[PDB]
Structure formats: C-alpha cells, structure tokens
Write a protein that binds this ligand. Structure first.
Ligand code: HEM
Ligand code: HEM
Ligand SMILES: [N+]
Ligand SMILES: [N+]
Ligand SMILES: [N+]
Lengths: 137, 137
C-alpha cells in the first residue's frame, strides 16, 4: 500500500526520482521552462548533470517526507505551507503540481512494480487542495 | 457515501444524535460517568431530559460540521484544536472519542440505512489522530 510505496521509493530514491521527473517533463513539455538548465537536453544528457541528480533527489526526498507525514493520504497544512513558501516555487500554481501527480501515477501504473496508484492519485489531489489552502494560486 | 451520510444525519439530526449517543453510553457504561445527570436513567427518561436533547443535538450539529469540513475523512486541524480546547472536554482523553466512533459505526452497520460505515470508521480514527496532534492525551 501507500506506506510500502514510500519504502519502495526511498530504497532506490535517485532512480525513481529521475524516472518520474523525466516522465513529468516528457508528458508536459511546457513544464521544462521552469528548469532553464534542463532546456534542450535528452533524458540521458540530464543524467550527466550533477545538479539534475541532486535536485531531483531533494525533490523526491521532500515528497516522501510529506507523504509519510500525511494522514490517510491527506498532507499536513504545514507541509503544504513549506511548499508554497519556498522561493523556488514562487512563480508556480496548483496546475504545475497537478500535472506532476498525473505523470507520477501514470508512471506507477506503467511500471512492473506493485504500487498503490489509487492512493498516490488521492495524495496528489489532496496535496493540490492543501496547496491552495496554504495560499498558492 | 460520506458526504451523503452527513446529509442523512442532518435530515433527522435530533433522532440520530440521541440514538447514537445512547448506543455509545449503553455499549460503554463507564462513559456515562462524564455526564453526571445521565447516571441511573433509562433511554426514555433521557429522551425527556432537557439538557440531554439540547446537548446531544449540539454534539451532532458540530460533529457534522467537522465531518463536512474534512478532506477524505481527515478533519481540519482547527476543528481538532477546538475540540481539545473546549472546557467541557478538559478531562477527556482520545479513548473517549475512540469509543464514541466505535459505537457510531456499529450503529450505522446495524441500521436499515445505507451508511458508508467504513468512511465513518476512518473519520473516527483520523479525528483521534488529529486530537492527539492537537495535544489531547
Ligand atoms: C510535491 C511536489 C514538489 C516537491 C516536494 C518539491 C520540492 C523541491 C525542493 C526540495 C527543491 C530544492 C532542491 C534544491 O535546492 O536542489 C525544489 C526546487 C525547485 N522546484 Fe520543486 N517541488 C515540487 C514540485 C515542483 C513543481 C511542480 C515545479 C514546477 C513544475 C517545481 C519547481 C521547482 C524549481 C524550478 C526549483 C529550483 C530548481 C533550480 O533552480 O535548480 N517544484 N523543489
Ligand atoms: C467528535 C465528537 C464530539 C463532539 C463534536 C462534541 C461536542 C460537544 C459540544 C458542542 C458540547 C457543548 C454542548 C452544549 O453546550 O449543549 C459538548 C459538551 C460536552 N461534551 Fe462533547 N463532543 C464530542 C465528544 C465527546 C466525548 C467522547 C465525550 C466524553 C466521553 C464528551 C463529553 C462532553 C461533556 C461532559 C460535555 C458537557 C455536558 C453538559 O452540557 O452537561 N464529548 N460536546
Ligand atoms: N522493488
Ligand atoms: N491502487
Ligand atoms: N471499517
């Protein structure tokens, strides 16, 4: 279930983070614009960039923290706050996050691994509603 | 489902409030001790007792609002705060709440209705989790 999925992801965090982030960018090419160093780069080119691996690691670490702190796939209001308040996120809206979770769930369903994709879909939706309540547009 | 159940309960609130609260006191006779005035009374005596009717209605009026404000059966932290901070709840621990929801879910399952009993069970558990987080012992 959801709790095991957090363990699965954490066990090989860099591999899942990179795989899912690339699925995100490739499903939604417009989102690449927020990451100027990623512009004009193939998947394998991004893997050769120190910042790519570092960044996506940090993103998925925080996502897993927020997931672990959630109750019944509903994130804490304070975690949504951390996400709204981050300077790196100042220009974002909830649609950016919504698209990320659509790509994440699609990835999980396509994978050979036994993820609880329904729970991740609920988690994404509940995060989107929480970001909005924490002041994101 | 859960949202419809809120509507069902509100549609005949006094009746459901009294019957569920009685189910609670009768399933857990020790809990009656918190309501001095209710000791040594049959169900029918209680249903003709002013404060019993007014009190149980207020409990279920607020419970339905807390349920309505929840996301995926997880209550707002502020609603949990309010319940922990009420002077009438100063002597309570999470266990009192745990027992109330066990009784409420059992009532729903035994009813002729179409309650989403497993949603109410989650709501009870999530409420208890929020009460703890808000400082109730
Ligand atoms: C639940 C989802 C998300 C989490 C947990 C998260 C977390 C993080 C973290 C921890 C960092 C700092 C990384 C570092 O300092 O190296 C970061 C940076 C950043 N995030 Fe997010 N993020 C999320 C969603 C998004 C989305 C949807 C976008 C845009 C589509 C986005 C855009 C950015 C950008 C542009 C940076 C700075 C990248 C850079 O300048 O190198 N984030 N994020
Ligand atoms: C989510 C569940 C609960 C809600 C929404 C709730 C709500 C309320 C409300 C609104 C009142 C004030 C009513 C009035 O002024 O007439 C009240 C009073 C009170 N509550 Fe609760 N309550 C809950 C659970 C409990 C539990 C589990 C107990 C103990 C086992 C409890 C013990 C009391 C007592 C002793 C009073 C004062 C009774 C009186 O007016 O004489 N409550 N509650
Ligand atoms: N695995
Ligand atoms: N699932
Ligand atoms: N249940």
């Amino acid at each position: 279930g959801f709790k095991q999925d957090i363990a699965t992801i954490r066990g090989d965090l860099r591999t899942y983070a990179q795989d899912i982030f690339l699925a995100f960018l490739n499903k939604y090419p417009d989102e690449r614009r927020y990451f100027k160093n990623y512009v004009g780069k193939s998947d394998q080119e991004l893997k050769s960039m120190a910042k790519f691996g570092d960044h996506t690691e940090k993103v998925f670490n925080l996502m897993m923290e927020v997931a672990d702190r959630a109750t019944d796939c509903v994130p804490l209001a304070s975690d949504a706050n951390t996400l709204v308040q981050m300077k790196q996120h100042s220009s974002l809206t909830t649609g950016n996050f919504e698209k990320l979770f659509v790509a994440l769930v699609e990835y999980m369903r396509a994978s050979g691994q036994s993820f609880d994709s329904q729970s991740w879909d609920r988690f994404g939706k509940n995060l989107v509603s929480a970001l909005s309540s924490a002041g994101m547009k």
